[PDB]
Amino acid sequence: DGEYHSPYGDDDLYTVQPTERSPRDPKAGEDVILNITTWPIENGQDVWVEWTKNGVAQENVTAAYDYNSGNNTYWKADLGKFEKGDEITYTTKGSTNGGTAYESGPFTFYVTDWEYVQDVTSVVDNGDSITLNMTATAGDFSPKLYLSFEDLDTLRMELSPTGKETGHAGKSGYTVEDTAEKVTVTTEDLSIEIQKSPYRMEVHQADGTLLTSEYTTANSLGWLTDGKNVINQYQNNFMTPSDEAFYGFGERYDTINQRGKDVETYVYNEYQDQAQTERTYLAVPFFVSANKYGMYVNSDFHSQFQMASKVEDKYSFVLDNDGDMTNMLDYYVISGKDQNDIVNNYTDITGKTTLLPKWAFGLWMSANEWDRESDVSSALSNAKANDIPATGFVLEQWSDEETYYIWNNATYTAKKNGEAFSYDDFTFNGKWTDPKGMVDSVHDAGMNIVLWQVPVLKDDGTVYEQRDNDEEYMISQGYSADDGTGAPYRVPASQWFGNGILLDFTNKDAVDWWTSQREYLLTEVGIDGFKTDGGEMVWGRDTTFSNGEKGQEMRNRYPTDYVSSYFDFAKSINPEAVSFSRSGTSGAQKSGIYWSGDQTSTFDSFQASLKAGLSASTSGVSYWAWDMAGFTGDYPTAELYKRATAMAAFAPIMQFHSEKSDPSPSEERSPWNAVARTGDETILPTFQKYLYTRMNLLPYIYTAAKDTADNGKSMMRQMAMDYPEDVNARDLDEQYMFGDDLLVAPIVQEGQTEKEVYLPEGEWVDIWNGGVHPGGETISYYADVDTLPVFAKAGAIIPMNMTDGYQLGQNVGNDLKSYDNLTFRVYPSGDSEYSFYDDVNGGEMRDISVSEDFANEKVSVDLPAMADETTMQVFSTEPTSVTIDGADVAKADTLDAFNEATTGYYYDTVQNLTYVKAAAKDAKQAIVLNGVNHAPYEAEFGHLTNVTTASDHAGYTGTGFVAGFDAEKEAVEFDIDAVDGASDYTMEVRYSAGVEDATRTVYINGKKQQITLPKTANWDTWNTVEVPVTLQAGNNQVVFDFEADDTAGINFDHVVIKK
Ligand SMILES: OC[C@H]1O[C@@H](O)[C@H](O)[C@@H](O)[C@@H]1O
Ligand SMILES: OC[C@H]1O[C@@H](O)[C@H](O)[C@@H](O)[C@@H]1O
Ligand SMILES: OC[C@H]1O[C@@H](O)[C@H](O)[C@@H](O)[C@@H]1O
Ligand SMILES: OC[C@H]1O[C@@H](O)[C@H](O)[C@@H](O)[C@@H]1O
Ligand SMILES: OC[C@H]1O[C@H](O)[C@H](O)[C@@H](O)[C@@H]1O
Ligand SMILES: OC[C@H]1O[C@H](O)[C@H](O)[C@@H](O)[C@@H]1O
Ligand SMILES: OC[C@H]1O[C@H](O)[C@H](O)[C@@H](O)[C@@H]1O
Ligand SMILES: OC[C@H]1O[C@H](O)[C@H](O)[C@@H](O)[C@@H]1O
Ligand SMILES: OC[C@H]1O[C@H](O)[C@H](O)[C@@H](O)[C@@H]1O
Ligand SMILES: OC[C@H]1O[C@H](O)[C@H](O)[C@@H](O)[C@@H]1O
Ligand SMILES: [Ca+2]
Ligand SMILES: [Mg+2]
Ligand SMILES: [Mg+2]
Ligand SMILES: [Mg+2]
Ligand SMILES: [Mg+2]
Ligand SMILES: [Mg+2]
Ligand SMILES: [Mg+2]
Ligand SMILES: [Mg+2]
Ligand SMILES: [Mg+2]
Secondary structure, three states, X not given: OEEEOOOOOOXXXXXXXXXXXXXXXXXXXXXXXXXXXXXXXXXXXXXXXXEEEOOEEOOOEEOEEEEEEOOEEEEEEEEEXXXXXXXXXXXXXXXXXXXXXXXXXXXXXXXXXXEEEEEEEEEEEOOOOEEEXXXXXXXXXXXEEEEEEEEOOEEEEEEEOOOOOOOOXXXXXXXXXXXOOEEEEEOOOEEEEEEEOOEEEEEEEOOOOEEEEEOOOOOOOEXXXXXXOEEXXXXXXXXXXXXXXXXXXXXXXOOOOOOOOEEEEOOOOOOOOHHHHOOOOEEEEEEEEOOOEEEEEOOOOOEEEEEOOOOOOEEEEEEEEEEEOOOOEEEEEEOOOOXXXXXXXXXXXXXXXXOOOHHHHOEEEEOOOOOOHHHHHHHHHHHHHOOOOOOEEEEOOOEOOOOOOXXXXXXXXXXXXXXXXXXXXXXXXXXXXXXXXXXXXXXXXOOEEEEEEOOEEOOOOOOOHHHHHHHHHHHHHOOEXXXXXXXXXXXXXXXXXXXXXXXXXOOHHHHHHHHHOOHHHHHHHOOOOEEEOOOOOOOOOOOEOOOOOEHHHHHHHHHHHHHHHHHHHHHHHOOOOOOEEOOEOOOHHHOOEEEOOOOEOOHHHHHHHHHHHHHHHHOOOOOEEOEOOOOEOOOOOHHHHHHHHHHHHOOOOEEOOOOOOOOOOOOOOOHHHHHHHHOOOOHHHHHHHHHHHHHHOHHHHHHHHHHHHHHOOOOEEOHHHHOOOOOOOOOOXXXXXXXXXXXXOOOOOOOOOEEXXXXXXXXXXXXXXXXXXXXXEEEEEEOOOOOOOEEEEOOOEEEEEEOOOOOOOOOOOOOOOOOOEEEEEXXXXXXXXXXXXXXXOOOEEEEEEEEEEHHHOEEEEEEOOOOOOEEEEEEOOOOOEEEEOOEEEOEOOOHHHHHHOOOEEEEEOOOOEEEEEEOOOOOOEEEEEEOOOOOOEEHHHOEEEOOEEEOOOOOOOOOOEEEEOOOOOOEEEEEEEOEOEOEEEEEXXXXXXXXXXXXXXXXXXXXXXXXXXXXXXXXOOOEEEEEEEEEOOOEEEEEEEOOOOOEOXXXXXXXXXXO
């Protein structure tokens, strides 16, 4: 028999327990209901509430029967409404037939209401900080708002409602213009305009451009208080135009643009339907606006971002607090040189991404079902047999499933008092007879291994000696958090690892103990890190951690304290160790890889994963992975598998994984198992193509990884991060930038083969075939199930590790300590420069520069000193000569000859690439290609109308030519860029006309001319005629038509634009 009421229950944001107070934190005028339970269900029960208001005893409130469920009766007691300042203390009671009264409480709540800033009464400039003394709209406080500069382009606001706290110092490079009506604070990067009566702030760039501004009606800034000693929430409100887009907020699965939504900064473990529930494991109170600023609310407490979700021109943040009136509101308005610089400034505040070793950027293999040595050996054997040179290996089902630090089937003498084991304490049996040997075999295969972990000590009520000993010790030492009553905090019963005891990662002694138990795994077994899963496990209002903080503040921070603790520990022992986690908040980026969690194998999930990666990126979490093609649900289709593979190969971290622990047939998301499950053998060569291409691009990818760590530029970015002004880039969620120079457009729709790609300003070249696409429009790209549209930005310099075949998608292996043929792929356009991170040769920075001068038929490359032979692949027409330091280098007629030569050049007519080989020298080398023009615009890649392509006459450039083009209504249209601005140019038209002289009609931006194409000796002989054209800057429409007055058949190879 009993009674129970607990006002906050588990303090879950989304649900309530059936015995809570509603509202949990009452405001003035809100009716207060107490939900109370009794058991068993029995006639003769009475439930009531004994209480005081401002210390005065009130008449008891009688509860009314609500409903019965299970062994319990539920009741509601109505306390009524209260006024601001009221302090209510109550005890709930239940009895049967006037007998033993069971009770809960006392519980106290302080009734609140909002107070807002009114006017600025005085301004004090302290040199490194500005104090604005203010009045309030209500109450007796004298608030102070402190302004400071984290940097000249990053403004910090700290609000003390009572005026008793002081803000932090910042930079002193600012000036102030203080007048009776307004104060303007200026730096070389910002102009902050503050109206004094009423108080209202606008943040502008130095030149005056508005970044954001507090809502028009002012009184925008406020706090929720009882007017005495409780401050429970803060808010500010801002004006936003109807076109403003909001990105980031951590990792989001529903949309990349949060306009219209209430975004909760609240970590949560939501399985499979993250998009639909709008939940996430990784929540960060930071967003980037395409209006060129970021806003970071510096608090671990839950916050709600109302992004034009209430009023169409208003966005707001509402930040919770634990009552403590000394906790100031602290937020930043972040400007920068560009959107990526904004993110860099954010990482100055919350932490830089820690550069991971290069092995982290190869393929990771994982499957929950791998649970014994024979599974590992078969996994390694299958990878080798299928030519899959992975670099990472994950084991989840490796332990006793009890302590999570002892190998499954290991036997030993149990240890008391939390003593740590060493490798020699164990007798290894059954599934794992030689863990050290097993790790040695993984290392032998060129891979590194990580082991799965959780931050909780399991307690499912079953007896298990070592786990029981550990629990006893942990409790005696206070290594758990406190439930608020002196007992250890346990995960709520109905949750993942319910009843388990969380390790208090804020407790250094606790962390030292916990990690000591895993030490032998790094020092003796030789593992390369941990897959630190979970962490979204902190509930309860009164839950208390060693640092004095409670559940409200610690829920979002806990996962990152957990993940960082393990990352640092593993790395302290093994410098090459890497963590792989799913949960966190601001700062998560300092500590390893984050994967998108648990999703099903559908295209809808794929779409959600892509959004999660793009949002995480904006939020500073660059080293992001996902379970490619999904880890659970029905096995993926061959189509999904192939589409997922392609995106994954061009994502920051590439990893396959599966959920099932012991299925039949296998659930592995490996390519060999995908072939087995779907019956589609073509999956293997398609997977190989993408894996091999990723490894060819590893120098570029790893340099990008370094750029994240040093400069805050995420590896994979939503289009508006690079092009914030471009109205077509705002909502794109099915394409992205990868590194600085690649535009990747995965197909994420079932059945799709015509893929739309928005190309921003500039020229974009298909990296697979050399097709040229002018920017500033949406193109349609035909992509079969094996094809991924990827384009290089104009001026791009891309380092690659190539085989002697020199094609993308050729297996170079997984050697991370040497290159095969280090190659630089170059798309000349003006003057371009790239800093290559040569990690193979000591991490030296190699500064490469390219100067395009097609106006004079030259492209120059300034190659710095290199440790290795270097191959340039320059997109251009064929040179008449190539020089290195002024000396001619020999033309190689075939690829074989080029490979045998120590220096020389070779022209690839199919890709329109000039290969140039330079010897390794401890001095810079000046390479010049002479007689070159911009690469041809291949006819077979133009817009074709009623005409087809062929390859059945030798001598063409590209993949072939347009065949015949000999009837009315047949057309070939080109999108041609003016190589050097608006001007006249010469257009070369390369064709064959074996039978007789021909004519075609050409329109240049609608201006017609007829061209004569004289007969060639035969269809195996090509000729080129020069046509004068006038081009405008940018894209030019060049249409070749066969009109009524034209004549004869031709084969049409390409066109070249030149001076
Ligand atoms: O002291 C008075 C209280 O005693 C209980 O036994 C009654 O059932 C309550 O409704 C009442 O408020
Ligand atoms: O074993 C007694 C249990 O009975 C249930 O009906 C109650 O709701 C539980 O809180 C209680 O612990
Ligand atoms: O827009 C800000 C407002 O949001 C509402 O949802 C909250 O309940 C209010 O307390 C707050 O003033
Ligand atoms: O299959 C693994 C999944 O199982 C679910 O029951 C848990 O809540 C998730 O945290 C976990 O990733
Ligand atoms: O209100 C329905 C019922 O509620 C509780 O079970 C009471 O003990 C009982 O006397 C009453 O009949
Ligand atoms: O096998 C290791 C772990 O992997 C799985 O993801 C399960 O969620 C967990 O219950 C299990 O203990
Ligand atoms: O029921 C849980 C048990 O599962 C397996 O037998 C594990 O090998 C063992 O360590 C664990 O106690
Ligand atoms: O910890 C539970 C048990 O695990 C292993 O089976 C040990 O060999 C045994 O001594 C111990 O009691
Ligand atoms: O990039 C050049 C061409 O590449 C492929 O052939 C695509 O199917 C096509 O749409 C594109 O225009
Ligand atoms: O009529 C034009 C055609 O003439 C010949 O048949 C050629 O073989 C063919 O390549 C060309 O397209
Ligand atoms: Ca051609
Ligand atoms: Mg009665
Ligand atoms: Mg959509
Ligand atoms: Mg900066
Ligand atoms: Mg198995
Ligand atoms: Mg080692
Ligand atoms: Mg303690
Ligand atoms: Mg120039
Ligand atoms: Mg060689």
